[PDB]
Design an enzyme around this catalytic site. Structure first.
Site, mmCIF file in Angstrom:
data_model
loop_
_atom_site.group_PDB
_atom_site.id
_atom_site.type_symbol
_atom_site.label_atom_id
_atom_site.label_comp_id
_atom_site.label_asym_id
_atom_site.label_seq_id
_atom_site.Cartn_x
_atom_site.Cartn_y
_atom_site.Cartn_z
ATOM 1 N N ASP A 15 0.817 -1.110 -0.090
ATOM 2 C CA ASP A 15 0.037 0.017 0.053
ATOM 3 C C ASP A 15 0.870 1.217 -0.028
ATOM 4 O O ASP A 15 0.233 2.485 0.390
ATOM 5 C CB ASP A 15 -1.203 0.073 1.197
ATOM 6 C CG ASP A 15 -0.431 -0.179 2.543
ATOM 7 O OD1 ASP A 15 0.724 0.265 2.621
ATOM 8 O OD2 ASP A 15 -1.199 -0.478 3.468
ATOM 9 N N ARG A 29 0.882 6.774 0.135
ATOM 10 C CA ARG A 29 0.081 5.753 0.757
ATOM 11 C C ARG A 29 -1.397 5.773 0.270
ATOM 12 O O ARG A 29 -1.899 6.682 -0.113
ATOM 13 C CB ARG A 29 0.147 6.301 2.330
ATOM 14 C CG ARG A 29 -0.709 5.327 3.118
ATOM 15 C CD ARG A 29 -0.278 3.964 3.104
ATOM 16 N NE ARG A 29 -0.870 3.324 4.352
ATOM 17 C CZ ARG A 29 -2.132 2.606 4.359
ATOM 18 N NH1 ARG A 29 -2.807 2.712 3.418
ATOM 19 N NH2 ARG A 29 -2.578 1.954 5.303
ATOM 20 N N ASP A 34 -5.821 -1.059 3.660
ATOM 21 C CA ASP A 34 -4.596 -1.615 4.752
ATOM 22 C C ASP A 34 -4.123 -2.808 4.406
ATOM 23 O O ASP A 34 -4.895 -3.894 4.162
ATOM 24 C CB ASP A 34 -5.202 -1.679 5.998
ATOM 25 C CG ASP A 34 -3.716 -1.881 6.986
ATOM 26 O OD1 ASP A 34 -2.699 -1.253 6.384
ATOM 27 O OD2 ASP A 34 -4.077 -2.347 8.060
ATOM 28 N N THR A 35 -2.761 -2.864 3.532
ATOM 29 C CA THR A 35 -2.156 -4.335 3.124
ATOM 30 C C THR A 35 -1.518 -4.972 4.706
ATOM 31 O O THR A 35 -1.190 -3.906 5.291
ATOM 32 C CB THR A 35 -1.430 -4.125 1.987
ATOM 33 O OG1 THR A 35 -0.453 -3.034 2.053
ATOM 34 C CG2 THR A 35 -2.134 -4.013 0.757
ATOM 35 N N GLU A 37 1.685 -6.033 6.675
ATOM 36 C CA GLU A 37 3.219 -5.618 6.361
ATOM 37 C C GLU A 37 3.981 -6.638 5.928
ATOM 38 O O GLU A 37 3.281 -8.036 5.666
ATOM 39 C CB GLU A 37 3.731 -4.957 7.645
ATOM 40 C CG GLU A 37 3.149 -4.012 8.623
ATOM 41 C CD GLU A 37 3.305 -2.819 7.806
ATOM 42 O OE1 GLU A 37 4.239 -2.379 6.958
ATOM 43 O OE2 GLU A 37 2.169 -1.731 7.672
ATOM 44 N N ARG A 75 3.853 11.527 3.460
ATOM 45 C CA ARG A 75 3.221 10.544 2.388
ATOM 46 C C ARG A 75 2.177 11.007 1.742
ATOM 47 O O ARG A 75 1.101 11.473 2.372
ATOM 48 C CB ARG A 75 3.180 9.015 2.845
ATOM 49 C CG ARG A 75 4.094 8.253 3.839
ATOM 50 C CD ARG A 75 3.915 7.097 4.222
ATOM 51 N NE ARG A 75 2.596 6.926 4.902
ATOM 52 C CZ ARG A 75 2.067 5.857 5.630
ATOM 53 N NH1 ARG A 75 2.838 4.659 5.423
ATOM 54 N NH2 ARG A 75 0.854 5.772 6.332
#
Ligand SMILES: Cc1cn([C@H]2C[C@H](OP(=O)(O)O)[C@@H](COP(=O)(O)O)O2)c(=O)[nH]c1=O
Ligand SMILES: [Ca+2]
EC number: 3.1.31.1
Length: 129
Positions: A15, A29, A34-35, A37, A75
């Site tokens: 992401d 971002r 939300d991917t 980690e 970001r």
């Protein structure tokens, strides 16, 4: 909302991606998602998915929403398009991201993202498996 030009500098993870935007390097971002980690389950698959989409694209575009354009880490916050296909939505559709971080006034594509998530969940894909 409007699409604006950007070029890939380098893939980072599911992401985040480094793009050149108005001639300046920035980390973006992806809004509304939300991917995992990279160290987490499906993290590497999410990274690979975003990497392939952005590296194979002939044209990258970013689209800012109506609210904040940068987060507290500097970001950029945007929807990213590869050859016209939204990366953010595509990750959710594939069960590689959850809809997340929906803040009011940067939520234009929330409906679209939630519909993709429902479909991924029905198909029991990846995260939803
Ligand atoms: C996606 C998104 C993240 N963020 C901030 C919230 C989270 O703060 P915290 O770092 O304090 O948890 C963080 C999650 O990003 P990551 O999922 O990349 O870690 O980024 C925003 O502020 N706006 C956004 O639209
Ligand atoms: Ca993440």
């Amino acid at each position: 909302l409007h699409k604006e030009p950007a070029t890939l500098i380098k893939a980072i993870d599911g992401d985040t991606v480094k793009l050149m935007y108005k001639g300046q390097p920035m980390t973006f971002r992806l809004l509304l998602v939300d991917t995992p980690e990279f160290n987490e389950k499906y993290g590497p698959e999410a990274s690979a998915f975003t990497k392939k989409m952005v590296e194979n694209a002939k044209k990258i575009e970013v689209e800012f929403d109506k609210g904040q354009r940068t987060d507290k880490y500097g970001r950029g916050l945007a929807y990213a398009y590869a050859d016209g296909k939204m990366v953010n939505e595509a990750l959710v559709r594939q069960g590689l991201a959850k809809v997340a971080y929906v803040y009011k006034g940067n939520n234009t594509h929330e409906q679209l993202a939630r519909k993709a998530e429902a479909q991924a969940k029905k198909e029991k894909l990846n995260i939803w498996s």
